[PDB]
Amino acid sequence: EVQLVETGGGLVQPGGSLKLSCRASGYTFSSFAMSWVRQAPGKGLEWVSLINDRGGLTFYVDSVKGRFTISRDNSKNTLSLQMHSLRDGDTAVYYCATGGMSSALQSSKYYFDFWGQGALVTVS
Amino acid sequence: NLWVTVYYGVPVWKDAETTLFCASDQEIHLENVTEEFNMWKNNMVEQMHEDIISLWDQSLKPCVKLTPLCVTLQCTNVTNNITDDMRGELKNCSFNATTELRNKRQKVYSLFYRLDIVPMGENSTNYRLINCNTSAITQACPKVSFEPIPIHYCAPAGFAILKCKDKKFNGTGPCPSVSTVQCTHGIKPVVSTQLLLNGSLAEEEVIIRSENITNNAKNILVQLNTPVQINCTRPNNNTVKSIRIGPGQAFYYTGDIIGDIRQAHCNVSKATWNETLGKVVKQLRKHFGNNTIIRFAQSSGGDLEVTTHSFNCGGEFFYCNTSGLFNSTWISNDSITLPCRIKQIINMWQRIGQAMYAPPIQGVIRCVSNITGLILTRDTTETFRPGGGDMRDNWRSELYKYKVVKIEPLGVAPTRCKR
Amino acid sequence: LGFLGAAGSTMGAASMTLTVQARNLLSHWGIKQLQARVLAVEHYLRDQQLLGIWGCSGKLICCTNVPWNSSWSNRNLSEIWDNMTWLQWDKEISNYTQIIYGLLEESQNQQEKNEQDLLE
Amino acid sequence: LGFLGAAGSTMGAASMTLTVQARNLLSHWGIKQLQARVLAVEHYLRDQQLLGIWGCSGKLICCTNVPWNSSWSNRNLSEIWDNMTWLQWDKEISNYTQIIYGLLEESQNQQEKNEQDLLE
Amino acid sequence: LGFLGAAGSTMGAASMTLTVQARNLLSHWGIKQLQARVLAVEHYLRDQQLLGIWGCSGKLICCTNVPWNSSWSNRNLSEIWDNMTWLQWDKEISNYTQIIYGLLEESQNQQEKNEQDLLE
Ligand SMILES: *[C@@H]1O[C@H](CO)[C@@H](O[C@@H]2O[C@H](CO)[C@@H](O[C@@H]3O[C@H](CO)[C@@H](O)[C@H](O[C@H]4O[C@H](CO)[C@@H](O)[C@H](O)[C@@H]4O)[C@@H]3O)[C@H](O)[C@H]2NC(C)=O)[C@H](O)[C@H]1NC(C)=O
Ligand SMILES: *[C@@H]1O[C@H](CO)[C@@H](O[C@@H]2O[C@H](CO)[C@@H](O)[C@H](O)[C@H]2NC(C)=O)[C@H](O)[C@H]1NC(C)=O
Ligand SMILES: *[C@@H]1O[C@H](CO)[C@@H](O[C@@H]2O[C@H](CO)[C@@H](O)[C@H](O)[C@H]2NC(C)=O)[C@H](O)[C@H]1NC(C)=O
Ligand SMILES: *[C@@H]1O[C@H](CO)[C@@H](O[C@@H]2O[C@H](CO)[C@@H](O)[C@H](O)[C@H]2NC(C)=O)[C@H](O)[C@H]1NC(C)=O
Ligand SMILES: *[C@@H]1O[C@H](CO)[C@@H](O[C@@H]2O[C@H](CO)[C@@H](O)[C@H](O)[C@H]2NC(C)=O)[C@H](O)[C@H]1NC(C)=O
Ligand SMILES: *[C@@H]1O[C@H](CO[C@@H]2O[C@@H](C)[C@@H](O)[C@@H](O)[C@@H]2O)[C@@H](O)[C@H](O)[C@H]1NC(C)=O
Ligand SMILES: *[C@@H]1O[C@H](CO[C@@H]2O[C@@H](C)[C@@H](O)[C@@H](O)[C@@H]2O)[C@@H](O)[C@H](O)[C@H]1NC(C)=O
Ligand SMILES: *[C@@H]1O[C@H](CO[C@@H]2O[C@@H](C)[C@@H](O)[C@@H](O)[C@@H]2O)[C@@H](O)[C@H](O)[C@H]1NC(C)=O
Ligand SMILES: *[C@@H]1O[C@H](CO[C@@H]2O[C@@H](C)[C@@H](O)[C@@H](O)[C@@H]2O)[C@@H](O)[C@H](O)[C@H]1NC(C)=O
Ligand SMILES: *[C@@H]1O[C@H](CO[C@@H]2O[C@@H](C)[C@@H](O)[C@@H](O)[C@@H]2O)[C@@H](O)[C@H](O)[C@H]1NC(C)=O
Ligand SMILES: *[C@@H]1O[C@H](CO[C@@H]2O[C@@H](C)[C@H](O)[C@@H](O)[C@@H]2O)[C@@H](O)[C@H](O)[C@H]1NC(C)=O
Ligand SMILES: *[C@@H]1O[C@H](CO)[C@@H](O)[C@H](O)[C@H]1NC(C)=O
Ligand SMILES: *[C@@H]1O[C@H](CO)[C@@H](O)[C@H](O)[C@H]1NC(C)=O
Ligand SMILES: *[C@@H]1O[C@H](CO)[C@@H](O)[C@H](O)[C@H]1NC(C)=O
Ligand SMILES: *[C@@H]1O[C@H](CO)[C@@H](O)[C@H](O)[C@H]1NC(C)=O
Ligand SMILES: *[C@@H]1O[C@H](CO)[C@@H](O)[C@H](O)[C@H]1NC(C)=O
Ligand SMILES: *[C@@H]1O[C@H](CO)[C@@H](O)[C@H](O)[C@H]1NC(C)=O
Ligand SMILES: *[C@@H]1O[C@H](CO)[C@@H](O)[C@H](O)[C@H]1NC(C)=O
Ligand SMILES: *[C@@H]1O[C@H](CO)[C@@H](O)[C@H](O)[C@H]1NC(C)=O
Ligand SMILES: *[C@@H]1O[C@H](CO)[C@@H](O)[C@H](O)[C@H]1NC(C)=O
Ligand SMILES: *[C@@H]1O[C@H](CO)[C@@H](O)[C@H](O)[C@H]1NC(C)=O
Ligand SMILES: *[C@@H]1O[C@H](CO)[C@@H](O)[C@H](O)[C@H]1NC(C)=O
Ligand SMILES: *[C@@H]1O[C@H](CO)[C@@H](O)[C@H](O)[C@H]1NC(C)=O
Ligand SMILES: *[C@@H]1O[C@H](CO)[C@@H](O)[C@H](O)[C@H]1NC(C)=O
Ligand SMILES: *[C@@H]1O[C@H](CO)[C@@H](O)[C@H](O)[C@H]1NC(C)=O
Ligand SMILES: *[C@@H]1O[C@H](CO)[C@@H](O)[C@H](O)[C@H]1NC(C)=O
Ligand SMILES: *[C@@H]1O[C@H](CO)[C@@H](O)[C@H](O)[C@H]1NC(C)=O
Ligand SMILES: *[C@@H]1O[C@H](CO)[C@@H](O)[C@H](O)[C@H]1NC(C)=O
Ligand SMILES: *[C@@H]1O[C@H](CO)[C@@H](O)[C@H](O)[C@H]1NC(C)=O
Ligand SMILES: *[C@@H]1O[C@H](CO)[C@@H](O)[C@H](O)[C@H]1NC(C)=O
Ligand SMILES: *[C@@H]1O[C@H](CO)[C@@H](O)[C@H](O)[C@H]1NC(C)=O
């Protein structure tokens, strides 16, 4: 069984910063690309950021492009996201997900295979 | 859906024949590579063969030619205490030698082995050197040793040598443990016939290698897993003299012998030799039946160069009779002494147009060496006899574990990447 | 990790050692050795010329515009990249190689001509 | 369609067989043959070096930033590419080859320096 | 203005004559001369191969993504480029040559993989 567990932050003031992280187990971490998907309390899903399995390539939705950093650590089976300037509009559940990309010699993905349960980030 | 992607630096190779180079006074394991080896089709053997012969000939290029000695010789019996085994073996020959000045001659006498001279017109008094009717003789330089100094064979860039590490490998087929080496280990170019000397030993068991074991036309190369020590000697104290035969050209010869005249010989331990054969017999029965008979016998015929065990012992050339080693039938502190003949005029390689004179060596000669393998031929009851006339077999016994391949770094494969 | 160390590895792993092998391609008595050095150079240059013709000069991994034909090999990506070694792959597609090379050459000629027109 | 098959065709046709000619540039008794082979390699390398200097490495058709001078040749494009062969053209401008090469080298030196500053 | 004329000039001036030196790298009795020519070619090719591996093929000036470590040399830009000759500089950092070369190779290998993924 694949498990993705978010261990995020809580309530933070507007204009501050908050870091999320996700621990993964049950699969070869290094074989998959990962992403963060956001869900505002009253909305559907939105893609936020995507990172390559080697950690070299990152992509962002324009609305966080100059504010969020997505990173990865393959020795610790850890995915992380550092958010800055925290707008009120960034209140959401942030889900850790596996999928969204694959790399050259692998078959394609372009969908998400596994989901964590999500950390709730609230901006005051 | 998929596109062609070009890769360069791909770890792929093909069998190839290239020129290897020598070096004289590093290994990658290749974890999951299995490769097919085929000794007897190994072109490294041919290169070693040609390099040894070429270098051999180069070493005689600056040496004194003995053509000025193709004269009639008057030969009498030796005035010494000669044992029965040596009767008729040596002759005391007198002749007129050229000297430093063309208008002068000198009378010289020397001792020769009977095998180096041939009577003329059935005249007891008149004899001549064996090579005079055939090609002219050349004296080997006294400053040049015959020591089998090892040679390493190294690949040129773009090529690699693969080494087989399977301890039970019999010379052909897949080898489950293969490593890449930059250059081979040093191989000693020891020259011998029916018994291989100073080679590598098998790691665990006696290994019998043959291109086709059931084809009696093929030679069988047997690698031992234990050495048999052999002690060879020529127990005669030789006094060596020299004369000038030309302008700075010296000729060396045995002047006389101090003390009694005895036959040269080699010793092996009787029990060690018997145990060694027992192991060979045991392995032969894996190719032949179990309830069988294996008989060993002496060489059936041919000249001295193929019916005896030939080797260079301290610079002298010995031709030993091995019938005492191969005389038994195997059905389902003693030693063996092998008498030896000595020759000074030899051909070395199985060639017609060349002949070398080996200068005699001062004093008494003793050499000790290891028997590391045998060359056998085959005729119920199977009979095996010593063989080994072809030198390429000696070199195969060391080169069987190496293969040369060419690196082919370019290749293609499908990926999902497109320009 | 040395020369050909990855030869027994799968294609997707061996592909990470391309510089290890690339660097080991370059470095009368004495003539046969001189001939060997000259020949090694000519061989090397032919492969480099070929990469140039295909538009892959200067790189070890080159993506092209020639589609892969299932008739050359119908194996899928996992089946190839995470299962086969390069020696096995090379044997499988050997017959169809001189077809692939011809296609790569034709593709590059068209690309260079199109680029030239786009620069008018 | 073989090597130099296009030699009698016009420049606009011959320009399509560049790979045919490029691939035919590479491949005591026996020494003079080595001298020829070593020399053939050095010749090849000098041309490749020159393309590198001009910034045309890796391609058979290369556009540059050096303008054409009417003093070298005042023929128009429909004349040169459609009613002339490469052998004829080579003779027509054989006196300006060194001038043109000098200009191409200078152009690239300036181009490399400008790119370096833009990457600051 | 000839070969090595700038050898005594500062690094920031000498760098403008790179084509002068690049063009002077290429062109039993008679054998030792063939050996010298063959080796000159192999030397040349090894340097070109190395530029290829680092992603600098085809150019005399190449920027990379490897940061300069202050431990190799802690001199500032005026000390290195406004004064200092290339001969002096090479001696100053000769002990870090292999470290730098190893880093350049690693950087390019990562660059190639990222580029391949961005095209799939
Ligand atoms: C199998 O291997 C053994 C072990 O290596 C080998 O035995 C060795 O043979 C050589 C002769 O070929 C012996 O070397 C001599 O040793 C004596 C005593 O020190 C020296 O006086 C000799 O010097 C003369 O000869 C030299 C040329 O070889 C001249 O340069 C010198 O000026 C002298 O004239 C010479 O060094 C060596 O001692 C033995 N080793 C042992 C342990 O006995 C055997 O020959 C090999 N068998 C075969 C068939 O190859
Ligand atoms: C080989 O023949 C020579 C020549 O006949 C022998 O030399 C002579 O020996 C006698 C003694 O028997 C001496 O008095 C002479 O002075 C010797 N002559 C010369 C020229 O030296 C020689 O002894 C014979 N050798 C053998 C082994 O038979
Ligand atoms: C060595 O030289 C001597 C002298 O040259 C030879 O002596 C010969 O002896 C007989 C006996 O009288 C003479 O008839 C010959 O005239 C001599 N020969 C000549 C041609 O001088 C002796 O035969 C020579 N030995 C050999 C075998 O060459
Ligand atoms: C090879 O074996 C023979 C025996 O057959 C050895 O000869 C004996 O050697 C001792 C010591 O010198 C003498 O006392 C004996 O009289 C010899 N016996 C015979 C029958 O001759 C010989 O020494 C051994 N040696 C080698 C190869 O060096
Ligand atoms: C080794 O010596 C033996 C003698 O001990 C030689 O064998 C003899 O050969 C003759 C002629 O064929 C036979 O009539 C004898 O019956 C054989 N004797 C024995 C005991 O078998 C043998 O030829 C010699 N071998 C070499 C290579 O010299
Ligand atoms: C690749 O195909 C696998 C099944 O392979 C079967 O056996 C091989 C030897 C071929 O004959 C092939 O055509 C057969 O279908 C699947 O199990 C695997 O999931 C597939 N992988 C991908 C990425 O599509
Ligand atoms: C174009 O060429 C003009 C003439 O140069 C001279 O004639 C040519 C054919 C060559 O032989 C050349 O070596 C001679 O010097 C120059 O005056 C003019 O500056 C050049 N052009 C441009 C566009 O700058
Ligand atoms: C190209 O030139 C053709 C011929 O023009 C005449 O001959 C040449 C060699 C020059 O001397 C020129 O000055 C002469 O007028 C024309 O027929 C053709 O139309 C021209 N092409 C274009 C596109 O204008
Ligand atoms: C920068 O250099 C630091 C000092 O280490 C010394 O220099 C390196 C290049 C080696 O030669 C080493 O053996 C010497 O002791 C390193 O500790 C540091 O990690 C380096 N940092 C970067 C970014 O390269
Ligand atoms: C660059 O460095 C110049 C010289 O600084 C002094 O000498 C060097 C060799 C070192 O030992 C350094 O620690 C010394 O202070 C300065 O004059 C110059 O201002 C510096 N450039 C800049 C932009 O600050
Ligand atoms: C794909 O391949 C189809 C069949 O294969 C053709 O014949 C075999 C024997 C050759 O080895 C192969 O290279 C040939 O292509 C063709 O009919 C089809 O046209 C090809 N399609 C493309 C896009 O190349
Ligand atoms: C030679 O042998 C005889 C016996 O036939 C013997 O009397 C004589 O002493 C021996 N010669 C020498 C020098 O010992
Ligand atoms: C000389 O030796 C031979 C053997 O080669 C022998 O037959 C002959 O009788 C001997 N003659 C003399 C005088 O000793
Ligand atoms: C040399 O003479 C011997 C003995 O008569 C003979 O057998 C051999 O064939 C001859 N060799 C040549 C080349 O004449
Ligand atoms: C013979 O074998 C022994 C085994 O202990 C070895 O030490 C010795 O060097 C070998 N001799 C030769 C000449 O190979
Ligand atoms: C060597 O081993 C191979 C194993 O495939 C076998 O086919 C061959 O017959 C064997 N040859 C000998 C002489 O044992
Ligand atoms: C091996 O030898 C046998 C004779 O026992 C022969 O019939 C067979 O054809 C030979 N095979 C090969 C491959 O040489
Ligand atoms: C050979 O000589 C060695 C000493 O060098 C000795 O130990 C060994 O027993 C001898 N072997 C035989 C068969 O005489
Ligand atoms: C050789 O082996 C046979 C095996 O039948 C044995 O009878 C004989 O006594 C052995 N000889 C020696 C010297 O060990
Ligand atoms: C031959 O004997 C060995 C034991 O030495 C045995 O393992 C093998 O099975 C026997 N082979 C046959 C055909 O009887
Ligand atoms: C072989 O052994 C027999 C005894 O079994 C013996 O009579 C014969 O002379 C020996 N042959 C040789 C060449 O030693
Ligand atoms: C050979 O005889 C000479 C006589 O001067 C002696 O000095 C030398 O030791 C002897 N050599 C041998 C090996 O008997
Ligand atoms: C060889 O195969 C084993 C699996 O049996 C694998 O664990 C090992 O990494 C492979 N070796 C190499 C060099 O790829
Ligand atoms: C290799 O292919 C077989 C096809 O049946 C598949 O079951 C196996 O999982 C594959 N192994 C890898 C590493 O892709
Ligand atoms: C190429 O075709 C031949 C046709 O006989 C076949 O035997 C060989 O295995 C093929 N090689 C491949 C599949 O590359
Ligand atoms: C040669 O000239 C004729 C016109 O006379 C033309 O049709 C033909 O295509 C030309 N040859 C080539 C190779 O272009
Ligand atoms: C050459 O010029 C004429 C006009 O004078 C034109 O009709 C013809 O098509 C041109 N040539 C070629 C070879 O295409
Ligand atoms: C090139 O220059 C020479 C003088 O060296 C002149 O005779 C020739 O006509 C010129 N070439 C052309 C095409 O004008
Ligand atoms: C040599 O140094 C002087 C300053 O001392 C400078 O004016 C001159 O241009 C320099 N020459 C070269 C070739 O760098
Ligand atoms: C270069 O300038 C600096 C700063 O003035 C000085 O310390 C250094 O010694 C000068 N250079 C050389 C190459 O000697
Ligand atoms: C380079 O290393 C040598 C040997 O340790 C040392 O003597 C020398 O000072 C070092 N050079 C530099 C610039 O650090």
Numbering used by the authors:
A (entry chain I): 1 to 52, 52A, 53 to 82, 82A, 82B, 82C, 83 to 100, 100A, ...
B (entry chain E): 33 to 57, 82 to 143, 152 to 309, 312 to 323, 323A, 324 to 397, 399, 412 to 457, ...
C (entry chain F), D (entry chain D), E (entry chain B): 518 to 544, 570 to 662
What sentences appear in the manuscript?
Broadly neutralizing antibodies (bnAbs) to the HIV envelope (Env) V2-apex region are important leads for HIV vaccine design. HCDR3s for these bnAbs mediate binding by reaching through the conserved glycan shield to contact a positively charged, semi-conserved protein surface on strand C of the V2 loop (Andrabi et al., 2015, 2017; Gorman et al., 2016; Landais et al., 2017; Lee et al., 2017; McLellan et al., 2011; Pancera et al., 2010, 2013; Pejchal et al., 2010; Sok et al., 2014). We then engineered ApexGT Env trimers that bound inferred germlines for PCT64 and PG9 and had higher affinities for bnAbs, determined cryo-EM structures of ApexGT trimers complexed with inferred-germline and bnAb forms of PCT64 and PG9, and developed an mRNA-encoded cell-surface ApexGT trimer.
The structures of ApexGT2.2MUT bound to PCT64 LMCA and ApexGT2 bound to PCT64 35S both showed the expected 1:1 stoichiometry and tilted angle of approach relative to the 3-fold axis as observed previously for autologous PCT64 complexes (Landais et al., 2017; Rantalainen et al., 2018), as well as the extended beta-hairpin conformation of the HCDR3 domain as it protrudes into the trimer. The PCT64 LMCA interactions with GT mutations R169 and N167 were not found in the 35S complex, but the interactions with R166 were retained by 35S. In addition to engaging gp120 through protein-protein interactions, both PCT64 LMCA and 35S engage apex-related glycans, in particular the N160gp120A glycan buried in the HC/LC interface. Mature 35S forms a larger number of specific h-bonds with the N160 and N156 glycans on gp120A. We found that three glycans, N156gp120A, N160gp120A, and N160gp120c, were displaced less by the 35S Fab than by the LMCA, which is indicative of better glycan accommodation by 35S. The steeper angle of approach also relieves potential clashes with longer Loop2b regions, such as the one from wild-type BG505. The angle of approach and HCDR3 conformation were quite similar for precursor and bnAb in the PG9 complexes but differed in the PCT64 complexes, which implied that bnAb structural maturation may be simpler for PG9 than for PCT64.
